[PDB]
Design a protein around this ligand. Structure first.
Ligand SMILES: CCCCCCCCCCCCCCCCCC(=O)OC[C@H](CO[C@@H]1O[C@H](CO[C@H]2O[C@H](CO)[C@H](O)[C@H](O)[C@H]2O)[C@H](O)[C@H](O)[C@H]1O)OC(=O)CCCCCCCCCCCCCCCCC
Ligand SMILES: CCCCCCCCCCCCCCCCCC(=O)OC[C@H](CO[C@@H]1O[C@H](CO[C@H]2O[C@H](CO)[C@H](O)[C@H](O)[C@H]2O)[C@H](O)[C@H](O)[C@H]1O)OC(=O)CCCCCCCCCCCCCCCCC
Ligand code: CLA
Ligand code: CLA
Ligand code: CLA
Ligand code: CLA
Ligand code: CLA
Ligand SMILES: CCCCCCCCCCCCCCCC(=O)OC[C@H](CO[C@@H]1O[C@H](CS(=O)(=O)O)[C@@H](O)[C@H](O)[C@H]1O)OC(=O)CCCCCCCCCCCCCCC
Ligand SMILES: CC1=C(/C=C/C(C)=C/C=C/C(C)=C/C=C/C=C(C)/C=C/C=C(C)/C=C/C2=C(C)CCCC2(C)C)C(C)(C)CCC1
Ligand SMILES: CC1=C(/C=C/C(C)=C/C=C/C(C)=C/C=C/C=C(C)/C=C/C=C(C)/C=C/C2=C(C)CCCC2(C)C)C(C)(C)CCC1
Ligand SMILES: CC1=C(/C=C/C(C)=C/C=C/C(C)=C/C=C/C=C(C)/C=C/C=C(C)/C=C/C2=C(C)CCCC2(C)C)C(C)(C)CCC1
Ligand SMILES: [Cl-]
Ligand SMILES: [Cl-]
Ligand SMILES: [Fe+2]
Lengths: 341, 36, 334, 442, 34, 137, 82
């Protein structure tokens, strides 16, 4: 009956927003990460780190605002407010990119707090903790993309900036520099995300079109009671339909719902592994056998060689503006170009 | 209690949203970020 | 006992291991024709002059491709939107050089896939089901129509339809971005929300049902054996699922009606994918993503680049390089 | 017991209120026609081409012959005003009747009168209502024939002299021509009914359609469905709705391709050039430019070995080179003077290109139907400056979208009509589950 | 007997207060000229 | 940086007299340029003849020099080829051809100065971007 | 089905709620406006005004290029606008 148990009582009170011990980590960090992004996208420039405007105050819209990464010259500095770079000056800290690490770091600890919350509530309510386990896939993605990937490169500058169009630029960078679409770990991620969306739609549709008639209304939603013991749709009719339509069907409701967890979670984990390789430029960029043949045989052309020409244009045409610290000067005569264009 | 009818509260709030969003779309054609 | 009535009874029989049906009567030959031609071409077809410039692209395994680089290559830009069946070629050799097989495959496939959707309605009717599973499938089907038929029509050439290949797919989406800025188009943005949200809700629903399975087994058994096919009682506790998820967020952000929950699961990715299919279909007529290039300038009139301008530098790089030999005039107007 | 979000399904069996819904909604259609025209006119500036001004309704009126003269120049905007006002005025009347029948009039009509009342399941009455509307449509098709032959004509982009309003004195009646169009392939170089390239075929087709529709209207008034038709269909309000949803979807897809490819009933003077047209015009432009400099365009070999300006189509016709090789089926009034029996004629190209053709190609090349959602003209990498998206892109995209969703509504309502007719639209009867009485598959 | 200030009260205003503040600042920005 | 009178100061004629535009004139010139010219000359290039641009060094080498208000105002009235040898009013918009180029009809004499002023000012602001094409976007 | 807090729908339809909030909501809106209209937002965050991205005859970006002298580089860039 000491202070610890008294505090435990209060943290675990049933209220509109459950708090819990995990709330002490989750709530401040979630609110600061969110508030950092809203503050920066509304008010803060990227002029000194990127040569870019990036806030509503500067003229940007929702698609173009961003909280951008620090300058390449910062390396992997934590960029703490009180640290040797900003030296406690809030204004300089904003201009040097400090909101980027602020958001990434508080974001990282909020993700941990949210997963602890899933564990905490699951334990108090009496259910198995599979929702927390599935949330490991978003965490793996965040840490590999926002933390591991720039930590293997020269600096934070090459991490994703927190913005709609800034993320689009990240996508296209990865095509032209890493040839990321060719990477089998990304392909496994694509199958997991697309397979998840398919399973989501096909399971939802199946349940809704094998419902039992449990009421007279034309709106079928009213004919369900959360405490009824009876299944609300026919597994038997659903299995027959899919067996005759597609050849196979689910027969076990537990396997089906475990499979729905398994597929997107596994896909995200796979893509995370490939991004860890790209931290080191360990790309699946080429097929060596293709290059040997193509170098010797100028009539040999595939969609593989066509795509590398596209990557080479991306690199040469975006690099000077996208990596301004390198002072790339490419005279017109060195730019790769097809005919006429 | 239930003095102000909720359908009226929703109508007025909804129009307040339309006005602010409309202002933001107007600003895409004037001043900063308009290309002029 | 009449010969036609007995055939009709076999076509629509609910007792065939695989349902045939009247839509199946069109689906089965068209899908077999598309499949057989696809497999043979993927393994063995000679190079195809996709862009009409007498520059053949090698698509098949026997001509130096692997599984990742292989494709059935779209038909020649010289054909445009002209119909090119076998009997219009002077010879199979001509038909192969010019990309005939691509047309045969995609036309038979779009027909058979359309009949696949009809077959889904039809069996649902014979079984006494509700009818709308086929409406969910219309979203992938519309997407296939967009990339194989609609986008060709708008650009004027099946040579700009999507190649039947893994790397050919990547070529298609890189060129699509340089010419339409699809990333900056809201219907593609909604497609991503349809597909990200779909994977999210798949994982959520799977994890919440799995979280609340009623104990029915020992630790030495798969919990899956706690459910028997066709049992009448539910196998999980939706009240416990709701009690957890409502506390994870807040109460009214969680579903306690299983019918509305599963309807939500159906509608979110279906609607998102309808929009992204409409994105491809309307960028077929060159209504492109938002263009904010040089939208921010300073008091003097200097351009102040945003991330949209960096995207444009990337788009420019793809533009100048794609089909590097096909353009003789300064604007790529289709 | 429909929910509020399915609340218009409560009108299925209330013929009086459903009549008001339809008539009120028709007032909305006519209101927008009226209001949009006045908006376009208030913003119209006659010295700018229509397609630089985001106009879609004024081009429809101009095509009927009103307001314009030679070359498509606007001479009098008063016809535009009239069309707008009369539509706007008429919407009040339809609005008035809609709300009366929806709020105050009899909830159901079949008590007030056996003529206006109907049961969806009454196959005789249903085909009678259909027949009346078929006649109305038939009269509608002949109004266009009337305008074309007796009331001033139609704008003709092909008229010698750059286009002009022309009275149609000899509409095409040969059914080999009129129905020949319906049997043309929809693929490239053929184009099904979208290929109609002259006003005589347009007017004659509408004479045929007017007569067919009137004849069909009288047919359906006087008959009831034959037994083979009675066993093949579902006879219910929702089924009829589903059938019309399919027809509207098909029609929207056709309209999409019509505005995208056809430059006869969508004159490029008003709508801007087609995609194929603008791409042909660019090749024309640099052919003209380079030949003025001394280039021999007929013998210039391009990088690939194909001609840089001119090449052969797969069936031999001489055509423009470069990527526009795909668009050689394009036909337009500024280009046809250069065509001989074998395609583009090198001697005409060398000697007979006119300044107006140079102007027209430069105009159409720089007004290709490419633009951003926020109306920045040109390819996606172009900078801001030119505020332009072609009316053809706006009309093609919007109607593809509408056509697609109406196909989905057809599927939705057709499947439901079937299930409601057989009695299982609300779910499976637990005590009588069909699959439970079928043998297992294995 | 309903309380006025709750944990919920704090959560609500923690988000709503700067939201309206930010909306006012963004509105003003639409009238900035270069 | 800002739009100062020095940037708004451009040559009036070949003899070297200068004129200082107002900010109002600059903005009006930009609007009229977009209205009547940008469809072919966006960013100082020429889409239908890329060999000829609106860079000041290009206009200086035209016959009649066109790198000054007078030369440009005259061009908008009676355009010639780059060497001065032929008049091209029938294929290039001009007041002389406002019957066949209707957007030229309602341009007053002061509009012409605003349009010419914009063409001479813009390369001072944008440098290489004016007339550089997509390499500099 | 409730945890003791007052229902939202009861709150926002109540007269007392709207008595307080017809002041607090516009006040916060006005405050945010003045944060921008007084120009204070520029100075707090260091965001360039439309006339202070470049020196008058400059087209080079003032990119930070040192980690530990970065604060002084920004300050030196800014004096080139005074
Ligand atoms: C899942 C669980 C949930 C996760 C929750 C995560 C929340 C916690 C967040 C932790 C924050 C970690 C930031 C560490 C910063 C970093 O690394 O900062 C980087 C510094 C090293 O600094 C870098 O050092 C480099 C090499 O320098 C050396 O080489 C130079 C060239 O010769 C000169 O000689 C120079 O003087 C010499 O020091 C360059 O100078 C870079 O610019 C400079 O940034 O390391 C250091 O702080 C320490 C690095 C050594 C310890 C490694 C710790 C592991 C962290 C990396 C693990 C991923 C590994 C990625 C590899 C792929
Ligand atoms: C009941 C079920 C019906 C089932 C029927 C089964 C067969 C259906 C056939 C559909 C295949 C259509 C291919 C269209 C290819 C194409 O070139 O189509 C375009 C043609 C128009 O063709 C063009 O027509 C042109 C006509 O213009 C000519 O004439 C003009 C006259 O001014 C101009 O002068 C112009 O310059 C000149 O070229 C030329 O001939 C071109 O070469 C030619 O390409 O359109 C058409 O025929 C008009 C109709 C096209 C409809 C196709 C839309 C399909 C939408 C699918 C939606 C999928 C939904 C997913 C479901 C979930
Ligand atoms: C649970 C809440 C939480 C967590 C985990 C974090 C976590 C973090 N914050 Mg955030 N922050 C929070 C709440 C939180 N913050 C709140 C509530 C505010 C509002 C005030 C902020 C405002 C804020 C700013 C402004 C910044 C951070 C930063 C950081 C990072 C560096 C912090 C550091 O080095 O700690 C150092 C401190 C400790 C590890 C605590 C030490 C406690 C030990 C155990 C006891 C020591 C004994 C003591 C000193 C004895 C004193 C005796 C005395 C008599 C002399 C890190 C990601 C920085 C950042 O993001 O960089 C980009 C940064 O600049 N935070
Ligand atoms: C084109 C759009 C359209 C039209 C014409 C209708 C028409 C109708 N609806 Mg439907 N409905 C629609 C859209 C539409 N609805 C949408 C989008 C929804 C979803 C929110 C619904 C949801 C819905 C429900 C849930 C129900 C209906 C019902 C009805 C019918 C009776 C309504 C009634 O008595 O209201 C009474 C309303 C009033 C007295 C308020 C005043 C409304 C008036 C008409 C406004 C007119 C203003 C206008 C400026 C007047 C001009 C005057 C001048 C021209 C003379 C009526 C035929 C009801 C029905 O079937 O009845 C059995 C019903 O239960 N509708
Ligand atoms: C689809 C349209 C439609 C239909 C089927 C009906 C049907 C009906 N209405 Mg409704 N009504 C409509 C439109 C329609 N109305 C419109 C648009 C208005 C507003 C003006 C009204 C206003 C109205 C009132 C005020 C009343 C009815 C009543 C009635 C009933 C008796 C009508 C009668 O005996 O007329 C007999 C036939 C005639 C009087 C001949 C009319 C000749 C018309 C006006 C000329 C032809 C028009 C032409 C074909 C198209 C318009 C031209 C345009 C394109 C420029 C009947 C159920 C009555 C009712 O329900 O009583 C309880 C009633 O009191 N209606
Ligand atoms: C809005 C127009 C409309 C509508 C909805 C109907 C509706 C109906 N008609 Mg009427 N009909 C109409 C106009 C219309 N008609 C007109 C204008 C005429 C005059 C020519 C007729 C002449 C007519 C006759 C002579 C008969 C009907 C009959 C029928 C019924 C059966 C229809 C059926 O099974 O078709 C389904 C169609 C088929 C089974 C055959 C399809 C053949 C086409 C050509 C397939 C091609 C489709 C293809 C994909 C697209 C390309 C088109 C191609 C021609 C190029 C139904 C109530 C029947 C009935 O019971 O009358 C009492 C009947 O015998 N109609
Ligand atoms: C001629 C056209 C037509 C007609 C008359 C009907 C009529 C009907 N439909 Mg069908 N429907 C159609 C087309 C049509 N539909 C199309 C094209 C689709 C595919 C999308 C559907 C899909 C559909 C579904 C899925 C369902 C119906 C249902 C119904 C019934 C109830 C409708 C209702 O109360 O909605 C009430 C109206 C609303 C709730 C408003 C919807 C709001 C829309 C979606 C947003 C509009 C915004 C717009 C896009 C622009 C945004 C800009 C912004 C400023 C707003 C009624 C019999 C229901 C049914 O089966 O009943 C038997 C039902 O569940 N319809
Ligand atoms: C530089 C440092 C910056 C950060 C410093 C750290 C600040 C963090 C403070 C976090 C605590 C704030 C939440 C509590 C506020 C409150 O109103 O509850 C205390 C009281 C609530 O009233 C009561 O509300 C109760 C319900 S509940 O607990 O609020 O859910 C109810 O039981 C009771 O009857 C009623 O009177
Ligand atoms: C960073 C930082 C910090 C923090 C801060 C904060 C925490 C902030 C917050 C902030 C916030 C918190 C903000 C907010 C804002 C908001 C907004 C700005 C919103 C908007 C929205 C909108 C616009 C919407 C709209 C709409 C739509 C569009 C549709 C639907 C409807 C609606 C209405 C929803 C501190 C101090 C610690 C210090 C350090 C730094
Ligand atoms: C039933 C219902 C509904 C619906 C309704 C409707 C839809 C209605 C309609 C209505 C209408 C549809 C209306 C209309 C109106 C109109 C009018 C009223 C007009 C007027 C006009 C005028 C007055 C004009 C004037 C002029 C002139 C003459 C000249 C020029 C100028 C001007 C323009 C000014 C709803 C959903 C809501 C709800 C529920 C129920
Ligand atoms: C005006 C014109 C013209 C003409 C046109 C015409 C003459 C047209 C006709 C059209 C027609 C004449 C059409 C038709 C249509 C048809 C249809 C579209 C059909 C449908 C069908 C169906 C839908 C069916 C179904 C079914 C089956 C299959 C099986 C059994 C069941 C049922 C019945 C469901 C021309 C071009 C010269 C020129 C321009 C103008
Ligand atoms: Cl390519
Ligand atoms: Cl070309
Ligand atoms: Fe489920």
């Amino acid at each position: 009956r000491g202070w610890f148990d008294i505090l435990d009582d209060w943290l675990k009170r049933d209220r509109f927003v459950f708090v819990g011990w995990s709330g002490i980590l989750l709530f401040p960090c979630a609110y600061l990460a969110l508030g950092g992004w809203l503050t920066g996208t509304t008010f803060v420039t990227s002029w000194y780190t990127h040569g870019l405007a990036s806030s509503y105050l500067e003229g940007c819209n929702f698609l173009t605002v961003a909280v951008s990464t620090p300058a390449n010259s910062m390396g992997h500095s934590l960029l703490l407010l009180w640290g040797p770079e900003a030296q406690g000056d809030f204004t300089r800290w904003c201009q040097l990119g400090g909101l980027w690490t602020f958001i990434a770091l508080h974001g990282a600890f909020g993700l941990i707090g949210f997963m602890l919350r899933q564990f905490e509530i699951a334990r108090l309510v009496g259910v198995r903790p599979y929702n927390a386990i599935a949330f490991s896939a978003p965490i793996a993605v965040f840490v590999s993309v926002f933390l591991i990937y720039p930590l293997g490169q020269s600096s934070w500058f090459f991490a994703p900036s927190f913005g709609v169009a800034a993320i689009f630029r990240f996508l296209l960078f990865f095509q032209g520099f890493h040839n990321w679409t060719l990477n089998p770990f990304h392909m496994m991620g694509v199958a997991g995300v697309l397979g998840g969306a398919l399973l989501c739609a096909i399971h939802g549709a199946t349940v809704e079109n094998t419902l039992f008639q449990d009421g007279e209304g034309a709106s079928t939603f009213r004919a369900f009671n959360p405490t009824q013991a009876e299944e609300t749709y026919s597994m038997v009719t659903a299995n027959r339909f899919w067996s005759q339509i597609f050849g196979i069907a689910f027969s076990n409701k537990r396997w089906l719902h475990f499979f729905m967890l398994f597929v997107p979670v596994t896909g995200l984990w796979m893509s995370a592994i490939g991004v860890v390789g790209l931290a080191l430029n360990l790309r699946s960029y080429d097929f060596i056998s293709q290059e040997i043949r193509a170098a010797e045989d100028p009539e040999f052309e595939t969609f593989y060689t066509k795509n590398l020409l596209l990557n080479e244009g991306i690199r040469a045409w975006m690099a000077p503006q996208d990596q301004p610290h390198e002072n790339f000067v490419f005279p017109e005569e060195v730019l790769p170009r097809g005919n006429a264009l | 209690g239930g003095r102000i009818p909720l359908w009226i509260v929703a109508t007025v709030a909804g129009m307040g949203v339309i006005v602010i969003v409309g202002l933001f779309f107007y600003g895409a054609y004037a001043g900063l970020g308009s290309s002029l | 006992a009449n010969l036609w009535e007995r055939f009709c009874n076999w076509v629509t029989s609910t007792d065939n291991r695989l349902y045939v049906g009247w839509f199946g009567v069109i689906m089965i030959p068209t899908l077999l024709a598309a499949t057989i031609c696809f497999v043979i071409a993927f393994i063995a077809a000679p190079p195809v002059d996709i862009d009409g410039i007498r520059e053949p692209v090698s698509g098949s395994l026997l001509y130096g491709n692997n599984i990742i680089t292989g494709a059935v290559v779209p038909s020649s830009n010289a054909i445009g939107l002209h119909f090119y069946p076998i009997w219009e070629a002077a010879s199979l050799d001509e038909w192969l050089y010019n990309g005939g097989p691509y047309q045969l495959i995609i036309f038979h496939f779009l027909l058979g896939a359309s009949c696949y959707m009809g077959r889904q309605w039809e069996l649902s009717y014979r079984l006494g089901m509700r009818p709308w599973i086929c409406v969910a499938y219309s979203a992938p089907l519309a997407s296939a129509f967009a990339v194989f038929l609609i986008y060709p029509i708008g650009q004027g050439s099946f040579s700009d339809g999507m190649p039947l290949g893994i790397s050919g797919t990547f070529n298609f989406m890189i060129v699509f971005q340089a010419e339409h800025n699809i990333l900056m188009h809201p219907f593609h943005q909604l497609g991503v929300a349809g597909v990200f949200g779909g994977a999210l809700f798949c994982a959520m629903h799977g994890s919440l049902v799995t979280s609340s399975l009623i104990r029915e087994t020992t630790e030495t058994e798969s919990a899956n054996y706690g459910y028997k096919f066709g049992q009448e009682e539910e196998t999980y506790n939706i009240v416990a699922a709701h009690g957890y998820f409502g506390r994870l967020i807040f109460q009214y952000a969680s579903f306690n009606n299983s019918r509305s929950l599963h309807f939500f699961l159906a509608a979110w990715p279906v609607v998102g994918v309808w929009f992204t299919a409409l994105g491809i279909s309307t960028m077929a007529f060159n209504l492109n993503g938002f263009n904010f290039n040089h939208s921010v300038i300073d008091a003097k009139g200097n351009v102040i680049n945003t991330w949209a301008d960096i995207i444009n530098r990337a788009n420019l790089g793809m533009e100048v390089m794609h089909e590097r030999n096909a353009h003789n005039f300064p604007l790529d107007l289709a | 017991g429909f929910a509020w979000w399915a609340g218009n399904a409560r009108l299925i069996n209330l013929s009086g209120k459903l009549l008001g819904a339809h008539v009120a909604h028709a007032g909305l259609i006519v209101f927008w026609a009226g209001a949009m025209t006045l908006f376009e006119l208030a913003h119209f500036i006659p010295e700018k081409p229509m397609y630089e001004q985001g106009l879609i309704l004024i081009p429809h009126i101009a095509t009927l012959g009103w307001g314009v003269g030679p070359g498509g120049e606007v001479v009098d905007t008063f016809p535009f005003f009239v069309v707008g006002v009369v539509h706007l005025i008429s919407s009040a009347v339809l609005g008035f009747g809609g709300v009366y029948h929806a709020i105050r009039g009899p909830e159901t009509l079949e008590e007030y009168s056996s003529f206006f009342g109907y049961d969806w399941k009454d196959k005789n009455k249903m085909t009678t209502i259909l027949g009346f509307h078929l006649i109305v449509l038939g009269i509608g098709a002949l109004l266009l024939v009337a305008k074309a032959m007796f009331f001033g004509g139609l704008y003709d982009t092909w008229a010698p002299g750059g286009g002009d309003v022309r009275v149609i004195t000899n509409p095409t009646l040969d059914p080999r021509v009129i129905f020949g169009y319906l049997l043309k392939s929809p693929f490239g170089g053929e184009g099904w009914i979208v290929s109609v390239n002259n006003l005589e075929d347009v007017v004659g087709g509408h004479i045929w359609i007017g007569l067919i529709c009137i004849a069909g209207g009288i047919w359906h008034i006087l008959t009831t469905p034959f037994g083979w038709a009675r066993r093949a269909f579902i006879w219910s309000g929702e089924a009829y709705l589903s059938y019309s949803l399919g027809a509207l979807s098909m029609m929207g897809f056709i309209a999409t391709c019509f505005v995208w490819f056809n430059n006869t009933v969508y004159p490029s003077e008003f709508y801007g050039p087609t995609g194929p047209e603008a791409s042909q015009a660019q090749a024309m432009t640099f052919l003209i430019r380079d030949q003025k400099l001394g280039a021999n365009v007929g013998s210039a070999q391009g990088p690939t070995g194909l001609g840089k300006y001119l090449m052969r189509s797969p069936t031999g016709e001489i055509i423009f080179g470069g990527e526009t090789m795909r668009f050689w089926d394009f036909r337009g009034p500024w280009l046809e003077p250069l065509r001989g029996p074998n395609g583009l004629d090198l001697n005409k190209i060398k000697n007979d290109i006119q300044p107006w053709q140079e102007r027209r190609a430069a105009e159409y090349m720089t007004h290709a139907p490419l633009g951003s959602l926020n109306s920045v003209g040109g390819v996606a990498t172009e900078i801001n400056s030119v505020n332009f998206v072609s009316p053809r892109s706006w009309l093609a995209t919007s109607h593809f979208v509408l056509a697609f969703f109406f196909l989905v509504g057809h599927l939705w309502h057709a499947g439901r009509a079937r299930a409601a007719a057989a009695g299982f639209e609300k779910g499976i009867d637990r005590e009588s589950e069909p699959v439970l009485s079928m043998p297992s598959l294995d | 007997s309903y309380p006025i200030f709750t944990v919920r009260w704090v959560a609500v205003h923690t988000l709503a207060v700067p939201t309206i503040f930010f909306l006012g600042a963004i509105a003003a920005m639409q009238f900035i000229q270069r | 940086a800002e739009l100062t009178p020095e940037v708004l100061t451009v040559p009036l004629n070949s003899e070297g007299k200068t004129i200082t535009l107002t900010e109002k004139q600059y903005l009006e010139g930009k609007r009229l340029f977009q209205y009547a010219c940008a469809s072919c000359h966006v960013g100082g290039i020429t889409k239908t003849n890329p060999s000829l641009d609106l860079r000041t060094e290009t206009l200086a080498l035209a016959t009649p020099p066109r790198d000054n208000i007078e030369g440009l105002v005259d061009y908008m009235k009676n355009p010639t080829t780059y060497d001065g040898e032929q008049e091209i009013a029938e294929v290039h918009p001009s007041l002389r051809s406002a019957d066949i180029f209707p957007k030229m009809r309602n341009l007053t004499e002061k509009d012409l100065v605003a349009i010419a002023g914009h063409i001479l000012v813009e390369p001072k602001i944008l440098g290489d971007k004016w007339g550089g094409g997509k390499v500099y976007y | 089905g409730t945890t003791g807090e007052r229902p939202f729908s009861d709150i926002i339809t109540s007269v007392r709620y709207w008595v307080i909030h017809s002041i607090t909501i516009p006040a916060l809106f006005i405050a945010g406006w003045l944060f921008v209209s007084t120009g204070l937002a520029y100075d707090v965050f260091g965001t360039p005004r439309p006339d202070s991205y470049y020196a008058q005859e400059q087209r080079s970006i003032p990119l930070v290029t040192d980690r530990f002298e970065a604060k002084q580089q920004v300050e030196t860039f800014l004096e080139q606008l005074k």
